[PDB]
Amino acid sequence: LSFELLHAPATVCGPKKSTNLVKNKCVNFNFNGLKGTGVLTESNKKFLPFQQFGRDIADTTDAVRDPQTLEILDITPCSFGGVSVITPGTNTSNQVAVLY
């Protein structure tokens, strides 16, 4: 077996793998180049045959198509936010409250 390598897209590269996906969970995900993080969920969007993934007004990846069941999923980055501390003066007490 001899390998001919040229300045070509190299149509013979090898096999890929797969793993059972998860939904409604914060998880790092990969999709045939598209690789990000977020939460996967069933989508109500109705793509058309040759469209693979979707974008939004912010020009960011929003929806993807699973290349094993021809279904549409949505992605939402895992939750985040600032935190604040409510407290009376330390001259008075030491109890605090936390606001997310």
Partner: peptide, 30 residues
């Protein structure tokens, strides 16, 4: 009306009008 507003206040509210999620899901909060 439940809002307990006046006939006018209602028109002012109605006259003045999902990019919010997109901006939010980038690092900016309101």
């Amino acid at each position: 009306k439940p809002s307990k507003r006046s006939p006018i206040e209602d028109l002012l509210f109605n006259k003045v009008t999902d990019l919010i999620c997109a901006q939010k899901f980038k690092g900016l909060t309101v």
